[PDB]
Design a protein around this ligand. Structure first.
Ligand SMILES: CC(=O)N[C@H]1[C@H]([C@H](O)[C@H](O)CO)O[C@](O)(C(=O)O)C[C@@H]1O
Length: 299
């Protein structure tokens, strides 16, 4: 009976945890009990960076990560998380399946012991705040929490806000005590973490589309039978259809839910946000020496 360990920052009640639990149940049923999955939610093992490292080193078997998070180690991958470059999940999937994406996935495998089995949709990030964001000019000086992620910081900085990086587990208390003014996350996350309880405004900035790769350590993969490999691949893809459809459905009806909770929802013009990102797209292309932003944006 193989027990695999899977870690996530998301908490019980999140879509990420619910999909992991559906995956664990699917694995146990398709395997007649031979594959079990122990879940370690709420970032008890660290953040996604720390968990990815645990897959590399061998003490964690599965975890979640965005394709663009690979840029911490594989700098060209960062481009897929630059603000406003990926237009929706299908676009991000084209990047993931392209020759470019295959090359990143091959480097993930051969250098970092990361096998990407699939990538699911985890939502488009939006911006909450303790005062309305009606246009980019409102961002000036906003103390906007961001994760420890350069592109989220750049979104905040180039919009004129003051980025404050801090771990996900600390965000609610930081909003409640008004140590920060706002944060940015997909709508299902805002709902599950109850950030709408401590934020009066939500701005549809659509600034970064998050996918969610399901990654298994290659050292664990090569110790599984090829039958178990096939069960896991099939289970991940089936659960991934449910996860992606659930996120899509929830992102839609959550605007109605937040309004019913008294949240002020704004729809700022996004063209000024894209224009504000131009010095970032040029820095990135010039630093890497090739027009990566340009062709990713056209894929
Ligand atoms: C797989 C994973 O851990 N995703 C986490 C992401 C990424 O760390 C970030 O987008 C950089 O890729 O940050 C969050 O949205 C956040 O802290 O607000 C929590 C989310 O659970």
């Amino acid at each position: 009976a193989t027990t695999l360990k899977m870690g996530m920052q998301a908490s019980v009640g999140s879509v990420e945890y619910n999909s992991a639990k559906m995956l664990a149940d699917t694995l146990e049923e398709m395997s007649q009990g031979e594959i079990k999955l122990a879940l370690y939610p709420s970032a008890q093992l660290g953040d996604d960076r720390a968990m990815l490292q645990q897959l590399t080193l061998g003490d964690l078997d599965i975890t979640y990560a965005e394709f663009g998070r690979m840029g911490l180690w594989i700098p060209r991958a960062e481009a897929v998380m630059l603000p406003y470059v990926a237009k929706d999940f299908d676009h991000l999937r084209r990047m993931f399946e392209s020759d470019f994406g295959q090359g990143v996935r091959d480097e993930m495998l051969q250098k970092f012991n990361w096998r990407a089995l699939d990538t699911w949709y985890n939502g488009t990030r939006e911006t909450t705040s303790n005062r309305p964001l009606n246009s980019i000019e409102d961002f000036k000086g906003l103390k906007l929490r961001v994760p420890n992620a350069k592109q989220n910081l750049n979104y905040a900085k180039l919009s004129g806000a003051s980025p404050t990086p801090m771990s996900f587990s600390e965000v609610y208390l930081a909003l409640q005590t008004n140590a920060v003014d706002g944060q940015e996350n997909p709508l299902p996350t805002i709902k599950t973490m109850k950030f709408y309880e401590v934020q009066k405004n939500l701005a549809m900035t659509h600034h970064i589309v998050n996918d969610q790769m399901v990654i298994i350590s290659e050292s664990t993969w090569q110790k599984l039978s090829d039958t178990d490999k096939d069960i896991i691949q099939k289970a991940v893809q089936k659960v991934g259809d449910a996860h992606t459809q659930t996120v899509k459905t929830q992102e839609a009806e959550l605007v109605s839910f937040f309004k019913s909770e008294g949240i002020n929802v704004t729809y700022p013009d996004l063209e000024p946000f894209r224009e504000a990102m131009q010095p970032l797209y040029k820095e990135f292309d010039s630093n890497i020496g090739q027009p990566i932003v340009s062709k990713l944006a056209a894929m």
